[PDB]
Amino acid sequence: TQATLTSIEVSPTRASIAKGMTQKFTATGIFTDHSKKNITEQVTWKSSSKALSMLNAPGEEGTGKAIAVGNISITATLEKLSGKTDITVTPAILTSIQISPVKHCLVKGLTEKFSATGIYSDNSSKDITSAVTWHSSNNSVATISNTKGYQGQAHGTGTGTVDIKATLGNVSSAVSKLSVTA
Numbered sequence: 001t002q003a004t005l006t007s008i009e010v011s012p013t014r015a016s017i018a019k020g021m022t023q024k025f026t027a028t029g030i031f032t033d034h035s036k037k038n039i040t041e042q043v044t045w046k047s048s049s050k051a052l053s054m055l056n057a058p059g060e061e062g063t064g065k066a067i068a069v070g071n072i073s074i075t076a077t078l079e080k081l082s083g084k085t086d087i088t089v090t091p092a093i094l095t096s097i098q099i100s101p102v103k104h105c106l107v108k109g110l111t112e113k114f115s116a117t118g119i120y121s122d123n124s125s126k127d128i129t130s131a132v133t134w135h136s137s138n139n140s141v142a143t144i145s146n147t148k149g150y151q152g153q154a155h156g157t158g159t160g161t162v163d164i165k166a167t168l169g170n171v172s173s174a175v176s177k178l179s180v181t182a
């Protein structure tokens, strides 16, 4: 309380966040006694553009939400002093994969086309059937192709049940239970 505030630093200094994701900013107060203090909950936060929304709800103080791709300047203000930083919003990232059909009954000797829908960090979606790698837990029940022009093509090779899944980098679809009948 004896110390006067002399500066505000906002961290991080450079950062990238995917569209639809969020970032917690920190406001660090610098004082005449050379102490540093977390003043994130005390400062006034603002953003230079709609592309990053500073969240207003209690407990969200200093949280920015990526609305649109671009460059945004962020400011923390207290006692007419301001600290600033820059953030970059990058394109939405793959967060989940939904495969269809969710379950299926296939007659042996027939072929069924599975599709993979990528769900992104802004909850946009895309057909990524040809981009994913398709997997079968048991080729003796069904095979599934990754061959160009046949991606997601599942062929009933024998009776039973099998797990079908799609993967793309570190993202994996839910398992689809494929039953093959005679």
Ligand SMILES: [Ca+2]
Residues within 6 Å of the ligand: 009, 010, 011, 012, 013, 084, 085, 086
């Ligand atoms: Ca900074």
Ligand SMILES: [Cl-]
Residues within 6 Å of the ligand: 013, 014, 015, 016, 086, 087, 088
């Ligand atoms: Cl940046």
Ligand SMILES: [K+]
Residues within 6 Å of the ligand: 052, 053, 054
């Ligand atoms: K806003």
Ligand SMILES: [K+]
Residues within 6 Å of the ligand: 095, 096, 097, 098, 171, 172, 173, 174
């Ligand atoms: K997933």
Ligand code: NA
Residues within 6 Å of the ligand: 046, 047, 048, 073, 074, 075
């Ligand atoms: Na600003």
Ligand code: NA
Residues within 6 Å of the ligand: 050, 051, 068
């Ligand atoms: Na915008």
Ligand code: NA
Residues within 6 Å of the ligand: 108, 157, 158, 159
């Ligand atoms: Na069989």
